[PDB]
Structures are given as C-alpha cells and as structure tokens.
Amino acid sequence: GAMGSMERASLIQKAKLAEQAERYEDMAAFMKGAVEKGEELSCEERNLLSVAYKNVVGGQRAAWRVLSSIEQKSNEEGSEEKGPEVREYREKVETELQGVCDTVLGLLDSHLIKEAGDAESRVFYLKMKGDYYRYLAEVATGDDKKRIIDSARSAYQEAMDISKKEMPPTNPIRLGLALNFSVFHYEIANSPEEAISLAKTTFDEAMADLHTLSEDSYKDSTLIMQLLRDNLTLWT
Amino acid sequence: GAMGSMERASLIQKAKLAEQAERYEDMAAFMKGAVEKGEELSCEERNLLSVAYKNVVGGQRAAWRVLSSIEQKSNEEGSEEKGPEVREYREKVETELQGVCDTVLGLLDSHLIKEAGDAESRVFYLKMKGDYYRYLAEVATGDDKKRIIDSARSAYQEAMDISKKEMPPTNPIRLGLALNFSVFHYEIANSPEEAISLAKTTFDEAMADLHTLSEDSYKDSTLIMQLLRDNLTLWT
Amino acid sequence: SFXXFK
Amino acid sequence: SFXXFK
Ligand SMILES: [Mg+2]
Ligand SMILES: [Mg+2]
Ligand SMILES: [Mg+2]
Ligand SMILES: [Mg+2]
C-alpha cells in the first residue's frame, strides 16, 4: 500500500491541496491512504472522503452513460454494424467504475462503519454505502442486480432508521440521505410513488423545524431542501 | 506495450469514443497506441492526437499552477511553516506533467516528424514539438531551462519557416502556430515586443487573404485570427 | 442527488 | 494558445 509511508496528517493535507487543484483521483488516493491508517475520521475528513470519490465516480458515470447511449443506438433500426469496440470500451469504463465503488465499499466495511458509534458518522457512512451500491446498480444487468439493489436499499434504510431516531429533521446529512434514497426509489427501484412520498415528507418535516436554526444552519438545510423541491417538481 | 494487441482502426475508433465521453487520458493512450503502429497519421488522426494530449496536459498545467501559487504564498511574509507537503505534491504533479510532455515529444521523434513530408503534417508536428517543449519550459528551473526554451524556439521556427513557404497565410495550422509562437515569445522568452509584432503581422497577412476563401474556410481562419486579436488586446 | 457538509 | 482543425 503506497500511501503507507506517508503521515496521516500529510495525506489529509495533500487531499485538501488536491481538491484545490481539482485533482480528484489524487484526492481519493490520499483519502484512501488516510482511512487505511486505521483511525476514525473527523467530520472534515469524512467530507474529504466523500467529495473525492463522488468526483471520481461522477466522471466515470458520465462517461458510462455517454457510451451506453452510443451502444444502444448501435442496436437500433437501420444501424450499421460497427464491431465490438463500443461494447468493449463501455465495458472497460464499467469495470473501472465498478472497481472504484468496490474500493469505497471496501473502506466502509474495513472498518469505517463498524467503528462509527456516533449517529452523524454512522449515518454518513451508511449513506455512502447506499450511494455506492446504487452506482453499482446503475450498471448491473446480471442476476446479481437484485442483490446489489437490495444491498443499496438495506444501507439506506439502516441509515434512515438511525437518522430519524437521532437527528433533527433539518440535519443536512439526514436531508441528503433522504434525497438520495428517494433518487434510489425513483431511478433504481421503479418506485416513483415512494420516491415522491419520501421527498415530500422529508421536505415538510424540515420546514417545520427551520425555526430552531441559526442563520448559517438555516442556509445549510434549505439548500438541500431546495434539491428535494427540484426533484418533486421534476417528478410531479 | 499494452495497446499492441489492438487493431489500429479500433484504437482510432475508441479514441473518438473517448473524446465523446470526455475520457481524455484514455483518448491519449488510444492515440499513442495508434501512433506506435508505425504508420503515418491522417489529418483527422493528427487532430485526435493533439486534442487528446492537450486536454491531458491542460489539466496537469492547471493543477501545477494552483499548487505553484500556494507554494509561493508559503514563502511569503508572515506565512506559517506548513512542512514539505505543498512542495512535495507540486513536484508530483510536475513530474507527471513532465512525463506526458516527454511521451508526446517521444512520439514526435520516434518517428512522426521524420516521416512527415507534406507541409501540413510536418508543420503540425513541429508546432506540437514547440508546444510540448513550451510546457516543459513553464515548469523548468534548473540550468536546463535555457536548453528547453531553445528547443521550443527551434521547433517553432522550423515550423514557421515551412509554413511561410508552403501554406497560405489564412491556413488554420499556420495561424495557430503563429499564435502559439507569439505566446512563447510573451510568456517564455521575455520577448513581448516580438510576441506583439508576430501576432499583428500574422493577423494582417491573413486579413488580406480572406477574400480567397469559401464561407467555411473563412469561418475556420477568422476564429483563430480572433484569438490573435484577443492577445493583442491583452498585450497592448 | 447530494453528497461535503460545510 | 490554440491546438483539432475541423
Ligand atoms: Mg504517524
Ligand atoms: Mg460488465
Ligand atoms: Mg492490423
Ligand atoms: Mg521537479
């Protein structure tokens, strides 16, 4: 493990630099080495981890979608045989994507989730687990697709259960979890009504709690509530 | 060489897909494998090669500049000692950048330039040689800096010499070469007056030749002439 | 979807 | 600076 010779604090330091330089592969590798030091992550460090791998897998997912779209057009009416190259390259990007998700899932299993006792950290990491299974779901086609989907569902649900018990309904992690689980329902689970019910209930419960908030926290929560609003306007 | 088992045509095909997916590292590796097949490149293939490596090194250069800026601020007045990490990471990006340039320079020496007999191809590749030495110049500091700069100068000049003899002054490769050699003068060679003289002479000679052009070629040439205009407005 | 809380 | 001619 090639970050093994770097100080934990230096990895975190370089992750922040990598973010500034928009060098997100680097950022993710620095944060992976930081996790493998074996210590729990602080709030700020958890944010670095998720921003890094979100950017990395986000480019992969965008590329996969472009290539999957081309490949579907190669299957269509009046479409000239172009060889195995579109499939081949979509598969190469897919396998790369799948390896990033497996790497993130591996960090969470070994051993971030099990050492996360506080609600803010446990919910954060279980939401990540749901998110990275959801990205595997987006590209899965075999039999295993159902099992990937269930695994995403199960992480999101455990996270939902904890967040409802332990966090205010304006909490930005709770809000973002609900948003993403609703996206899961709409885009993965073929459950748009659940997606809409969850987004609306989450939005309405946060609205009723905003009065408890300082001006800065109000800003943090209403940003994500707007994202719920955006999906509901898209979905209805 | 890990593209060695792929068909030349399949590499070109996948390079085009990679461009569409904005997967430019991939695109560059496909085009490197295509070059190493040993055949001359067509016009369209030469464009793929330069778009690919421009995007790759362009991200590197942007990152290097961010990190070099941070590092210079760490050297300033009232600036707290932060350790060797900013330097270390700027060096890592620098070395990566230097390897991409060396890879491009290596393709041109082995053996694109020497087999390029036509003016459009020879000028294209010598401009690339100038460009990738100029990127090495941007980060060079040792004694070798002068020699890198001369090497950039020398490629640009040979390309300028051929383009003047063999191409119309509206030719987009000739125009882009002049633009970049002028940037070389301004940004690398500490010769802003030369930079301005070259941009203005190039612009004025193209303007007088635009009447010879079809509507599509007029569009191609005036785009780059506008870029000359932009630099002159920046520089004067 | 949404993922770096202030 | 400038580098894919139509
Ligand atoms: Mg230590
Ligand atoms: Mg596959
Ligand atoms: Mg062959
Ligand atoms: Mg160096």
Residue numbers in the entry:
A (entry chain A), B (entry chain A): -4 to 231
C (entry chain B), D (entry chain B): 1 to 6
What does the paper say about this structure?
The hub protein 14-3-3 binds hundreds of different protein partners, typically in phosphorylated and structurally disordered regions of its client proteins. Hotspot analysis, by means of truncation and mutation studies, of 14-3-3 in complex with a binding peptide enabled critical interfacial residues to be prioritized in developing a non-natural peptide stabilizer of the 14-3-3/ChREBP protein complex. In addition to the phospho-binding pocket; (i) Asn226, (ii) Lys122 and (iii) the hydrophobic patch formed by Leu218, Ile219 and Leu222 were critical for protein complex formation.
In contrast, truncations of Thz (−1, 2d, dl-4-thiazolylalanine) elicited a 43-fold change in binding affinity. This fold change translates to an individual ΔΔG of 2.2 kcal mol−1, the greatest binding energy contribution of the N-terminal amino acids. The backbone carbonyl of Thz(−1) forms a hydrogen bond with the side chain of Asn226 of 14-3-3. Truncating peptide 1 at Thz(−1) (peptide 2c) resulted in a conformational change of Thz(−1), creating an additional hydrogen bond between the N-terminus of Thz(−1) and Asn226. We hypothesize that the alignment of the −1 amino acid backbone to Asn226 of 14-3-3 leads to the strong contribution of this −1 amino acid to 14-3-3 binding. The further truncation of the peptide results in a loss of both hydrogen bonds (peptide 2d, ESI Fig. S6†). In contrast, N-terminally truncated peptide 2d does engage this pocket with a phosphoserine and binds uniquely via an N-terminal motif in the 14-3-3 binding groove. A structural overlay of 14-3-3 bound to ChREBP and 14-3-3 bound to 2d clearly shows the complementary binding of the two peptides within the 14-3-3 binding groove. The phosphoserine of 2d occupies a composite pocket formed by the phospho-binding pocket of 14-3-3 and the α-helix of ChREBP. Cooperativity analysis of the complex elicited an α-factor of 36, indicating strong cooperative ternary complex formation. Utilizing the functional mapping results, we developed a minimum peptide sequence (2d) that was able to selectively stabilize the 14-3-3/ChREBP PPI with an attractive cooperativity factor (α) of 36.
